[PDB]
Amino acid sequence: SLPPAIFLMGPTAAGKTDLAMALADALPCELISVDSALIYRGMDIGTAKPSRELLARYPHRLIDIRDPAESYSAAEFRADALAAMAKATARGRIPLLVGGTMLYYKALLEGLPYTVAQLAIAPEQRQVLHARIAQRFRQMLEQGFIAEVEALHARSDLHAGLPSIRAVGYRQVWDYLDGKLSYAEMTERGIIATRQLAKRQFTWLRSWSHLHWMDSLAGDNLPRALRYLKTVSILA
Numbered sequence: 396s397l398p399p400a401i402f403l404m405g406p407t408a409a410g411k412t413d414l415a416m417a418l419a420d421a422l423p424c425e426l427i428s429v430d431s432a433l434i435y436r437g438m439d440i441g442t443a444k445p446s447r448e449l450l451a452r453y454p455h456r457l458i459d460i461r462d463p464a465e466s467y468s469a470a471e472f473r474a475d476a477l478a479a480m481a482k483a484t485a486r487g488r489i490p491l492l493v494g495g496t497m498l499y500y501k502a503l504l505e506g507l508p509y510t511v512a513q514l515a516i517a518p519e520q521r522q523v524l525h526a527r528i529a530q531r532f533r534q535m536l537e538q539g540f541i542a543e544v545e546a547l548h549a550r551s552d553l554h555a556g557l558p559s560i561r562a563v564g565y566r567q568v569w570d571y572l573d574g575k576l577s578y579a580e581m582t583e584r585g586i587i588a589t590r591q592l593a594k595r596q597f598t599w600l601r602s603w604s605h606l607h608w609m610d611s612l613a614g615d616n617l618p619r620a621l622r623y624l625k626t627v628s629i630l631a
């Protein structure tokens with residue numbers, strides 16, 4: 396028999412982290428982040444990383460595990476995720492992998508000794524997701540996104556071409572700091588970059604099988620999610 400596992404994916408800004416925390420309060424879960432950007436320390440505001448307080452009450456594996464000067468491959472994610480899942484399983488906890496880095500999920504499924512239930516969340520209308528993406532980005536700037544990048548920009552061991560700086564929006568803020576862009580251009584292009592990411596994620600998701608879709612605007616996703624576990628033959 397194979398131990399249970401949950402995958403919670405979807406495009407950026409869909410509210411995945413929100414639902415993960417809810418599920419974490421209904422079942423004994425072990426939150427595991429599947430995000431090539433959240434792995435970096437010092438990149439919290441621009442990455443929409445859960446606050447230090449929220450992480451305290453909802454611990455996430457694979458968050459803040461690398462310095463921005465370091466690289467992280469899908470191969471390393473695979474090994475770390477398998478380790479975290481086995482560790483949670485041994486404790487009777489249900490591995491709950493939440494995030495939108497499809498390349499990571501792919502490496503795990505292909506290159507799994509688990510009976511996986513796969514959940515996905517997003518708005519029915521992409522226009523709803525787009526508006527939130529623009530608003531969320533503008534708020535990041537208000538909460539100190541620029542100051543956050545200034546600290547990275549000041550490091551001689553970091554440059555704009557690094558893997559870490561590929562996290563959406565960071566390069567635009569970096570260029571702004573280089574005096575190459577106006578505040579307006581930095582904002583518009585960071586939003587475009589993020590909208591572009593969602594587009595790439597949707598492409599991956601539309602071709603993915605065994606996905607139980609949920610609506611970001613729905614108010615009862617918890618009960619709906621808890622109900623699906625049985626469909627995939629998982630008794631929890």
Ligand SMILES: [Cl-]
Pocket residue numbers: 430432433442443444
């Ligand atoms: Cl994220």
Ligand SMILES: [Mg+2]
Pocket residue numbers: 411412443
């Ligand atoms: Mg999130």
